[PDB]
Structure formats: C-alpha cells, structure tokens
Design a protein around this nucleic acid. Sequence first.
RNA 1: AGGACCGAACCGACUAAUGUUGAAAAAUUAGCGGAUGACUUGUGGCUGGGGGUGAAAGGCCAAUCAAACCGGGAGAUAGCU
RNA 2: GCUCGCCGGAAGACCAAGGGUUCCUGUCCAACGUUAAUCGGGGCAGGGUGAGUCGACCCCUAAGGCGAGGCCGAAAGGCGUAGUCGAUGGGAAACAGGUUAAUAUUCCUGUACUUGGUGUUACUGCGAAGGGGGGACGGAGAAGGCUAUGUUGGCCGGGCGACGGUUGUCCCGGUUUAAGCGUGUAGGCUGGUUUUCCAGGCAAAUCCGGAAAAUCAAGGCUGAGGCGUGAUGACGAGGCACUACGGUGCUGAAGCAACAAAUGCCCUGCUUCCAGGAAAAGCCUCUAAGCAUCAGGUAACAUCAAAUCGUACCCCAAACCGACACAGGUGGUCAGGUAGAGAAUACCAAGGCGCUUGAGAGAACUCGGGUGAAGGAACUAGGCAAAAUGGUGCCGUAACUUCGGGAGAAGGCACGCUGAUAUGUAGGUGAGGUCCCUCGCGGAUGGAGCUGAAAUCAGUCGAAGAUACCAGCUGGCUGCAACUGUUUAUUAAAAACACAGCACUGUGCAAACACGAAAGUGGACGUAUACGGUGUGACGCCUGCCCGGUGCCGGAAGGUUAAUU
RNA 3: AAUUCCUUGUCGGGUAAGUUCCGACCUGCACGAAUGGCGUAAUGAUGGCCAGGCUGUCUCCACCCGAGACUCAGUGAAAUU
Lengths: 46, 271
Amino acid sequence: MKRTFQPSVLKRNRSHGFRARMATKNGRQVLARRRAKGRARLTVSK
Amino acid sequence: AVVKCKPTSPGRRHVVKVVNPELHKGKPFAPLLEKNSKSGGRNNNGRITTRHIGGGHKQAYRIVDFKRNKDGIPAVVERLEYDPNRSANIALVLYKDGERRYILAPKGLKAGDQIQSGVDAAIKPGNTLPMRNIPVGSTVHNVEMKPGKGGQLARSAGTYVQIVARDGAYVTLRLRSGEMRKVEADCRATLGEVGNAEHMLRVLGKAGAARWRGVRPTVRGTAMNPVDHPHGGGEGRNFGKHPVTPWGVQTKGKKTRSNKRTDKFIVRRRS
RNA sequence: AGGACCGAACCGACUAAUGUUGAAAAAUUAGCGGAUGACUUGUGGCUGGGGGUGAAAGGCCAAUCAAACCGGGAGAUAGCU
RNA sequence: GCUCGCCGGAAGACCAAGGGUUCCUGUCCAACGUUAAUCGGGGCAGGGUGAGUCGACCCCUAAGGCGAGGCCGAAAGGCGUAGUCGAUGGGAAACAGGUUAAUAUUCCUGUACUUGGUGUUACUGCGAAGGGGGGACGGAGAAGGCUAUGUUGGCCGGGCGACGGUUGUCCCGGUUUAAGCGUGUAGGCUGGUUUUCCAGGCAAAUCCGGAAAAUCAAGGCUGAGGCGUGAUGACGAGGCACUACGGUGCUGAAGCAACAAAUGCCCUGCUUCCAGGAAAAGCCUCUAAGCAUCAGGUAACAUCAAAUCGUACCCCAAACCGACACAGGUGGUCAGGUAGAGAAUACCAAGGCGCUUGAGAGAACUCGGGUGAAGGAACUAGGCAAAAUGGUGCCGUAACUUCGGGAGAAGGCACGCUGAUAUGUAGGUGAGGUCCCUCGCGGAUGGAGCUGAAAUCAGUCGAAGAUACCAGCUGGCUGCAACUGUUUAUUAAAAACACAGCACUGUGCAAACACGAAAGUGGACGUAUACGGUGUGACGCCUGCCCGGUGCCGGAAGGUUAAUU
RNA sequence: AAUUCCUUGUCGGGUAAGUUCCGACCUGCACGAAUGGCGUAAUGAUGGCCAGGCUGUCUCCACCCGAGACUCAGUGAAAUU
C-alpha cells in the first residue's frame, strides 16, 4: 500500500526550506515564532 | 473529399474523414514555427477559467500573415499545408524577392497560382485589397476590423463576408453569422472564400477523437449535487427549474451583449 | 487500419474463502477485467478551505471532508448529563 | 564439510530515489533479535569511500518560479517587461586486465582520448548582445543487413569408470581478448560545379533565400557490422617448488569453424497515417560598428592545466515508505539451458536461499487440499462454491445483422514413438573452384559443409500420445445501456457518469464567459464550418396538442414610480 | 412494464407441480414522445429465466494428505474486572 509520505529532499527543501520561508513575510513570521520558542532546528534545512 | 470509414469495429462505424491529397505530406516551413504550450484552460492564477479544455496532441504554431501588407510584390503558392491550430488550411507562398509566408488558403487556390496585394492588384481570389477598391457585392474573407491590424473576420474553414454597400468612408458587411456590420472603407480584405468547406462534414465518430482535439468531457449539471450546480440533484431526474449557467444566468434566450461602446457599426444583429 | 481480438509484464478490483485483539488501520489465496490506448509510469511544476479539483460519488484535497489541518478569539454557550 | 529442498523475467546481478556507516576486521552477549546464541543490520574499538574521461558542479533552456523599472492595489500585496533562476531534456573526452579483509572505468600495468592556457614557426581578414544553417524531435507498420548470445563440430587437456557394458559415433572442462586507430561495406539522403543579377533575412553580408545562363554526369553527406591493428601482450583449463593447508611466484596447451539468432544496432532510417508531433546553447557560417607593417584567425610542434563535491553499504528490501527484523508499496538496467508462439509455464545454469521458536502426539473442531459407491441441483434467495471445458491442423457452422459481424457459433476427425519415402526431403545458409572486373568488404557461376520443417505410407507400446504444468463450459428467451471507457481510496462498478451524434441558446472580437477590489490572465496567438452554456445521448422510424401560469425575447399609447428640483 | 395498488390480473407456453420467466389481452391505481417515444446487430466481471454437460451443492456423509488445535521446553499478550 502506497502511504502518504514519499520522501524527496529536493521537494522538501523547496517546500519548507529556509530560503522558501524567507521568500514571503508569512514564512518569515514562522521563523520568528520558532526563534522565540527557542527551537533548536528552525527548518528542515538538513 | 469525404470518405466514410468501414464498420470494422465500434468507434469506426460512424467515423467520417475529410482527406485532402493536395496537402503537403511533409514537415512545415521551420522558420515560420513557434512554440505553442497548452494551457489546460487555466489562467495566470492557476484556476480553470474555461472548462472542458485539456490534453490533446502536441501542436506547433504557424506564423500566418493576416496583414498581407507586402504590396506590389507578386507571390506564388508553393504548397498547401495542414494547420493544427485552425480548421482552415494554410498555403506557403514564395514572393519574387525570396521571402516566404503563410496565408489562409482560399476556395480554389492551388500550387503555382499567383497572388498579389495592394490597391493595384487584380480582383482574383487570394488577392488582398482595401474595401475601397473591392467592387460592391463581391465575396471576401480575412476581413480587417480596423485598418492595418490584421484580418479578424471570416477566417474559419468555409466562412466569408459579403459587401452589401459602401457609404463613403464606411462599407457595410454581411458577416456570415447575420450581422450587417459596417467597417471603415480602408481595411484590407482578401477575395474569395476560405476553402475547407468539407470540414463541417467531418464526423469524429468516437469519444477518443474529441480527446485528441483537447476537449475534456462535459458533465451536464442536472446529474450533479445542488452544492455544485444550480440544477442540482433530486431523487431521480427532477430538473424542476429554469435552465441556467453554473453561475446563475438563463442560457435560453437571455442576451448577454452589454458592450455599448460601439453601438454604431451594428446595422442589424442576426435572424 | 482498429478507444479491434486472445494473452504475460503493467494498471485495475467482479466473485468466493480466509483474516476481523489480522502478516496487513482493506491484505492474502484461487478465479476475474483492460492490456496501442479516453492507456500506463518516473521526475518537476501549478490550482488552497465556502476555496480547489471532480467522465459527478458529495468523490478527493497527507490513514481526517455536507466545508482540511494548526494556532488564536476561548475558560464560546450548554434551561442538559 | 557431505547430502536434501527452494528461487532462477528472481527469492540472481547493477543503479536512481531514499536512508546515512547499516560496509570490513577484532572484541563483547546485559538490553535489542518474538526461543537459545559462541551468532547479528546489537554494544565497544579500529579501518574503509583515491577520477581531466563516471555523476554533480558547470554551459543551455521547458513547464514554472522570482522579477530592476513599470502597471495595479486601504496596508500587506498582486501581475508582469528587461532579465535571472529552474531537468525530468541538449552540450568535450577511457578501455581491457590485475589488485584490497573492506574502494576502483577512481589505485596498478598496457594502450588511448577530450577541451583550454602559454610559447615557437609558417600562412593569413579578424571582429556580435546581430543574420542564416544546424541542433530539432509524433504514432503505427514493414522488412533487409548485423551484433549480443546460443548450439554443434573441430581443436587442446584430462578421464577409462563403486554394479552389466563403456579405446568409441564414448565422458568432463576449456576454446576468452576491449576502447582507440586504419579501412568506409549492407544500406539511407541529396543532381554537382562556375559566373551574373535581386523590393527578402530590422543595418550590412562572400552566408541564407530568390531569379537567369553555361558546363559535367559523378559529387558530397550519413552509416551498423565485418576485417586489420591494438595483441611476440593480456587472459587461459591444468601443472611445478614454496604451501601457517590461509595462499602466492614461475610455467601454462588449444584459443578455430559452421549454424541459429534478438524486444539490442544500422534506424533521429524507410513506408504509411492524422490527432500534424519542445525550447535554447555548444557547433558551422555571415558580415556590422571596429582593428590592420598590429590585434586576431588557421595549422604544426612544445609545454602547462583540467579545480571543487559525490564515490562505503542496502536499494522489490531486515538498511527506503508502512509505529515492528511487518505475507503490503517502490522507478530504471542486465535477460543462460531443455520444452514452448512467448519475458506464460515446468525443470535447471550462473548466483542466492530454506523465510530467528523447536520437539512429540496423530482426538473433536477449524483451515488449505486429494479421492468417492448409486443418484446428479433433489442444495440454495441464487448452480454460491466446486466440478467441468481448455492446444494445433482440417472439415463444418444457425437465427439475426448496421453486411463488419454473430463465429473459436454448435459439432466432428487426426495427434506418441520407430522406419521408409529422403543413409536429413522441401526450404534456409553457403565454402572451394571457375568466369568477369572501375583488381574491391566486388559481381556471376558453383555447389561442398552446416541447418532443417511438414506430409504420406508402414510398423509398434499403453487403459489413456494437445498424456505433466499450461490451457474457452456451451446453447435458447428477455429487461436496461449503443459500444471502448469513468465512478463512491476503505461494504454500492451499476440501469449511474462519459461518449460520438442531435437540438436550443449566447457570443462580431477589447467576443460571450470565467479567475481577479484592480492591473491583468484564460477563452485564443482562436474569429460564427469559431467559442461558451444547457438538455438529449450511436444508428433506424419519429418526436403530436397547449403560450393561461413562470421564465425568456420584442413593443409603444396609457397608468404607476426613485434620487433630484 | 425498472412504471399495475387491487394482483400470484386473465389465457397460452415451459414443469409431475412455475407468486419468477416468455408470448398475448388492455380494466394504463399512476406509459408517452429530446428531463425524448418505440425498435435495434454488436458489446457487458450488468438484471431475470430455461436447457445440455458437470459435479460432495445435496440425499448422506466416509476416508486420506498437510497447517493449527492437544502434550513437553523457551519466550510471553489482550479485551474485561
């Protein structure tokens, strides 16, 4: 049975990567929220 | 001509083809080709604006000369070619100076025929002249709505226009739809009729034939839920309401023309 | 020549049994349909919630859909238990 | 270690994606492993991934993304030009052998190849953000010529048989060699060369396009394989001294032919069809502004450079996606033997495995199967399930029909083995010889050798010869839908949806319409034989009556009627 | 009749026996002509019905071959309360 998650590093980076988040104001606010929470890993960079 | 396929299998029983041996059995003139990517009926927002568009055979656009502004240079038809972008056929014409161009094929135009453009050209099919020089009552195609912007009317398989009167600056036209429209008597037009008259006689014969053209299936609307179409659902087949678009307009006589900008070039509408 | 025929790969899911704290949050076994096409598949892209997409079942939109998910208004209100 | 069983179009081999040390060695057995464990994809420690040629990076662009100015929008922001990004596509070059416990087209040996920098010599019109060419493209089908590969013979080495026979028409094994370079063949495409002229290619042009003459018929391009060389090498079944019985030096014979043959190659070809089948750069040319006893360009030789990152291992799975060492899912490449139409199926080779609880017993009952007296649907909502049919050739085949079908209708007959026809025929392949020749990878002739159906006749064994696996039950009446298709992922595959066809209606192009506060985009680089909406649903015969109601389309006289005044 | 309540309408066919099926009749509760009417060859994992063949579907179950069940050793759940 094919499941929902089909990993792809390229698609992962261009969907939730650091540069993708910085491209839009809403994505920038996501980083700000995570920084305020003290997240150890801001995005799915690596 | 029109040939009816034999009923060797279902899907070929009702197939009627229109085979024209005069067409070129080879690749088109490469310099006059451009990329033509399919849209799928979606605009720059990515939303389906026009429904029932998608798929179909890959096509390459042909640069067809709709202005015919090369005046005083005779041209000779090289060959007739099949155009996937339109119902009519295009003709490759070679000018005396060595330039090649694509034009819509008139009714009785064949290889080796001579055509010309400009006020001094003769009154023969394929020649382009302003309406001022066109004798009244003659049949023309590829009519220009405005001077110099390229032909826009009567460019389909077997359509044409009739010049009924010339009231000085303006010339009245009988568009094949029925309008007695009038345009300025300076717009270029081509003599004769666009020759593919047998095109309308074509019968696709099967569902897959339509899909080749890029036409996706049409869902009626009565066979739909109320949340989707105004016609909506019901236990069985009810349809107890006036016919209407998916967005709420009559579609059974309700005129939708609300331009009002011109209102001057329309002598009569239709019918 | 063919949305042609028989039939593997491939894509489907008509019948039956088993399983039903399963090997498996839909599968296995034996049969079954399509199998040059309106076919199928890899990679990438596009359409975002009263919106999308839909050969149209209210189907599908991350095991969730007659209005997704996450956070917030919020300790909504509950003549009810 | 010896047997046994299983997969073998994989349950083998190599990758992408994904994972990220699971790889190799030593060591340990608490936990993890559905049991034990000395073992492990477990713990701990060490080692392991060597590239000018492989991939990425890089150059080029598709869909699409972003987008200086710009247009639009309360703000946020939206769209988009010039541009700049974006592979799943295009663009220079390495092969064979050997080698590590673990890497190699990356190291080693041998033999090559590509693109640039610089220098020298010779000869020289060079120059682009421009022009042209090229790159550059579909489906289906048909062969022909090849190769991978296989079989047999020959050749070389070894063998003479645990039990009758086995020195022969016997048995086992081997019989392998690349890129590159040279040759330019089967075959495909195109008439060459020279001069003059020209409203075209945004300007120019010797290039491209066009026109007009003369002169020759042989020019050019493309092209699998074969052959030669590479190769006096390498490899090589087996030997000979070392030989921790773990392995290395040295030596190492034959290394040919015929036939069969691809889904691979010639082929981005050819033929045919309609649904008419990317872009850009590299590359090849053309000149412009410019630079000219320069600079640049071409050729030879010399020299230098080719960085950086990935490279282990799994990759139909115990390492990826499924919470699991989970009967699931997962793209590409390789494709042996016998039988077979076949990548089905059966048994096997190479290779890999016996699926991480076992040992007994041989109750009911459950599960998956085998056989069955007589009857044969009496079962049951229902022939559910099971049983049965099943191949090739020939004969034969109804109503009905849109003349294609129905149809493999139904039904019947023959199938093994041996011999002969014919010590292997028809056919296919094709050596030597001879003749010809533009003396070549040539043509003709020639038929050796090899390969090889099918049929007839006769004889013969069994209960059964399409003996296994594999492999249509058939016929009659009838409702619905024309048909192939589509649909509720996960109780509904249908008579539902689509459908070709038909009709009504809107729409003259800045189209209707749709998405958008707007700009704009789709419709469409389309133009009424077009496009949108609605209903009906192939085809055949047809589609009657009603305009009071509702809607829609027209109408002008009157009545009533908003802001405003 | 995919439409008929009364209703298993009535007659005929098929069966020893037919609320289904097929062919007629018309008293159409409550068919009807593009939300189409009536036919229709071919097609269908479509609905109904009847035959031949075939059989453990059944009269009526018997035996046999395997995996569980049972015993021994090791490991070791669950709902519920």
